[PDB]
Amino acid sequence: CPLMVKVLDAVRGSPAINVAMHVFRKAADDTWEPFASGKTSESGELHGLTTEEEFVEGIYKVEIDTKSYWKALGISPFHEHAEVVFTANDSGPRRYTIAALLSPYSYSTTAVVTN
Amino acid sequence: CPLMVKVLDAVRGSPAINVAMHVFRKAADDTWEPFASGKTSESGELHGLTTEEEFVEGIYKVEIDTKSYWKALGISPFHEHAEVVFTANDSGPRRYTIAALLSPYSYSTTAVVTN
Ligand SMILES: CCc1oc2ccccc2c1C(=O)c1cc(I)c(O)c(I)c1
Ligand SMILES: CCc1oc2ccccc2c1C(=O)c1cc(I)c(O)c(I)c1
Numbered sequence: 001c002p003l004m005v006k007v008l009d010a011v012r013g014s015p016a017i018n019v020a021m022h023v024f025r026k027a028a029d030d031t032w033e034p035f036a037s038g039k040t041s042e043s044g045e046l047h048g049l050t051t052e053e054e055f056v057e058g059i060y061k062v063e064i065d066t067k068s069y070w071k072a073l074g075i076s077p078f079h080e081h082a083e084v085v086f087t088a089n090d091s092g093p094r095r096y097t098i099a100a101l102l103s104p105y106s107y108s109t110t111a112v113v114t115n
Numbered sequence: 116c117p118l119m120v121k122v123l124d125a126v127r128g129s130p131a132i133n134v135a136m137h138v139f140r141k142a143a144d145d146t147w148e149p150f151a152s153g154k155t156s157e158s159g160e161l162h163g164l165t166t167e168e169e170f171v172e173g174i175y176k177v178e179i180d181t182k183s184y185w186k187a188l189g190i191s192p193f194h195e196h197a198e199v200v201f202t203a204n205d206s207g208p209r210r211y212t213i214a215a216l217l218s219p220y221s222y223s224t225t226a227v228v229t230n
Contacts, residue, residue, distance in 0.1 A: 105226045
């Protein structure tokens with residue numbers, strides 16, 4: 001699992017469950033091409049998005065649909081989505097965990113990158 | 116000043132000075148059109164982006180060039196940029212501060228919306 005995404009809820013102190021997200025990869029013409037998508041599980045984690053063969057060098061974007069998550073909880077959030085953009089595998093393959101911690105008007109994102 | 120941006124540095128404990136950013140407004144065809152841009156001041160703030168007349172309801176994206184900021188300090192960053200995508204809503208007189216707190220492998224953003 002070279003790319004995993006973990007989402008937490010800072011209001012409830014819990015994993016953020018059923019959070020949809022889309023992953024895009026920048027193509028040679030500099031447009032965003034669909035790469036993978038999914039939703040977080042009961043643990044707030046989304047596994048199995050890609051494989052080591054498919055996950056080549058490039059610039060990737062993870063668009064986390066935080067708006068839908070908050071609205072289903074009756075909260076009108078500030079952000080449309082949390083957007084994480086990064087170069088992957090520039091120095092050879094890595095494993096990437098993209099984490100997001102969500103509040104209605106704020107979010108943080110970090111990456112844990114291992115060899 | 117209906118819209119202001121402030122950027123802090125979590126490694127140095129200081130405003131993030133000379134950080135470039137562009138603001139985009141979502142167009143009818145889902146494209147991002149340039150709206151405003153600038154560089155943060157010695158206080159890490161960017162003022163005068165727009166006016167109340169021009170800053171109408173809609174979806175806006177602030178794209179913060181965090182990669183160049185870290186490169187200039189000699190620090191290897193994870194993100195290509197920090198993106199903040201939000202809907203501007205007319206519900207009372209509102210002034211928006213978009214803030215970002217930067218680390219090489221992590222960032223946080225929040226909105227301080229006041230009257
Ligand atoms: C931005 C997301 C985030 O905010 C934080 C605030 C305080 C401490 C950690 C975090 C954190 C994490 O990244 C994170 C949390 C867990 I639990 C975890 O298992 C993994 I891997 C990553
Ligand atoms: C993500 C932005 C952010 O990260 C933080 C981490 C800890 C405490 C506060 C913050 C903070 C702020 O909102 C913020 C900070 C300052 I100083 C400020 O002048 C204004 I307006 C806003």
